[PDB]
Design a protein around this ligand. Sequence first.
Ligand SMILES: [Ca+2]
Ligand SMILES: [Ca+2]
Ligand SMILES: [Ca+2]
Ligand SMILES: [Ca+2]
Ligand SMILES: [Ca+2]
Ligand code: NA
Length: 704
Amino acid sequence: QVPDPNQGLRAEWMRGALGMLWLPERTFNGNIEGIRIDDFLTQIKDIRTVDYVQLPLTSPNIFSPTHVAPHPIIESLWQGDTDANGDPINLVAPRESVDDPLLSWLKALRAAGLRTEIYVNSYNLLARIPEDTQADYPDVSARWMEWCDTNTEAQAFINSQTYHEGNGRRKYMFCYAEFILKEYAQRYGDLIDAWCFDSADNVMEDECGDDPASEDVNDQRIYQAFADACHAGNPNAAIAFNNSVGDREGNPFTSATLFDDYTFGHPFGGAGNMVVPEALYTYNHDLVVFMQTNNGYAFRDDTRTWNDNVVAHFFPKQSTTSWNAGNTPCLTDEQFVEWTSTGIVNGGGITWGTPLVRTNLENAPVLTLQPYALNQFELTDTYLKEFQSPGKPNWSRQYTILPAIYPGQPYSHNLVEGVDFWDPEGVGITGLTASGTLPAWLTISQTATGTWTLSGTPPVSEASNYTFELMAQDSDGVTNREVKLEVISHPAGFTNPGDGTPVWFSNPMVLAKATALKDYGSLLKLGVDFYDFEGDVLTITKTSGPDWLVLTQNSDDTWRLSGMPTAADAGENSFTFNVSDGILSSDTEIKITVDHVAGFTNLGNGAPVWSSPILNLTDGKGSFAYNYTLQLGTDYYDFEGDALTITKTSGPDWLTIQQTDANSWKLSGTPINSDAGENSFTFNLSDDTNSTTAEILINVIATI
Ligand SMILES: [Ca+2]
Ligand SMILES: [Ca+2]
Ligand SMILES: [Ca+2]
Ligand SMILES: [Ca+2]
Ligand SMILES: [Ca+2]
Ligand code: NA
């Protein structure tokens, strides 16, 4: 039904809206499994005026194939390929049987009272640079295309319409919208408020022949495919496509397609600092002023009527370096507050590119804000609390979420002045009360100065939901907020013991097998592995078993087992795990089989082995210092995990060995040209009793 009469209107909440960005990097090959936004949300507890957070579905640029949510089709593209370390390769989603990180983040954001915006790079599973190869998913792009032009459903689709085919990789783009993108949208439903599609003109216009400038639906079919795929899941989801920055001499936003509910609103300037050089400061600040002048509407300035509700929105960076990370702010505290307030107070919306400390999941990630970003956001919060909507009380964020109804169980939730609601002028909240249809069992009382409590006990027979208004009062009047109550729904696979005891899924519990000298990874998750029928907060403890297994909490509903076993841990390992609610608890037995490192031959008598009789090493160069590290698990192995010693037994004098650490020995020395050619050495590997020797062979190239 294009042109769509809901276009833009469905992003009305975006007007005055303040957003943040949470973007981990290098998400592929299981990396994203078990990752949680909870620490971030803890850190920003005191930020009451923020409205939403942007999350990846895909990563940008050459990482556009890597997804953070599981999909059957994408998982198939894996084909189980592995690395020289056994680690996955060509896996560009989380394994469906392991984790859905996105659903985690989506629900945590909901519970935290926040809406969501989802980032998708338009190039998706295709390769942005086809004459490049990605050494982590080397042929996923190939396989996606492969899957596309040979599939019962996925040709009946490619051929289902005439406009599906055309220039470049157009047909594959429609694949993604229908089979990948639509499945996600349908799954998540109203947990997703907005989608922003990056690199849209790069691929949809320049490659696949769409015209974003046009108002002919036939020119914007890919734009349609993507929007419709999103609207199938949430008809109120606001859509934005990155069709480049606008004009410094005019509208700073590239004109709306028929499928834009809001402006993507990329800043002027390339990579790096969006306010240096200085001209960019003017261009970008004028963009924010544009949002103010136009009361948050992007396109009330042209000759088309249909785009008149499209919301003005900006996607700036807070750091000097990137959207999602960066050590240094590009704006002063004062400038940050001014830009934000100029842009959104009776204006449009802003997704700040808020920097986390360390986003690379392969390098000890710290997925919380840079202290300065919190600083700036807090100063902003103080301002918006006082000045965004003066007079009557303000409620926090976008929603007020109440705990679930548990039939027969006591109900209790606090609403706190300064947290959930406040008087802008700071005199105080003089009352809280309700109107509408409330549980007969519910009392609303003031339990301390500034704290109201919703409490009571639903009967066992309570099975109804509730929708009513809470009303906060100050000297100036009342402001309403719609709140919901919903009856809990227990997961299947669990038997209520009737006494409040938290329970494990089964006993024993066999987890995926570990490998010696390899970091272990397994998850324990509320509602899957353990559960509590009163929804009490739970603690898990390892109570017995070998030392190597490490337990850490990722969130209130997610724990992680890690650690590196040794060859000594080989075979069936057994562990006790307690789950407690603080009052009652229960145990289970966890079983993990530790396998030996592959590629070595057990001799059966306790002797260490070596990877080979001849370890052919890296060339040396005459007069250049030589270095090479021998590694337990790569070069040499002991099936009992005994401490090993390597001593030299023969060969040229220039090369010696010294223990680096428990697991590695360094061969070093400086060869000269007189040492040119194949230098043969012998080394002995002894443990306590049994010893085996190997040959090390280094070719020394003379410096001519
Ligand atoms: Ca707000
Ligand atoms: Ca217009
Ligand atoms: Ca007031
Ligand atoms: Ca309990
Ligand atoms: Ca041994
Ligand atoms: Na799961």
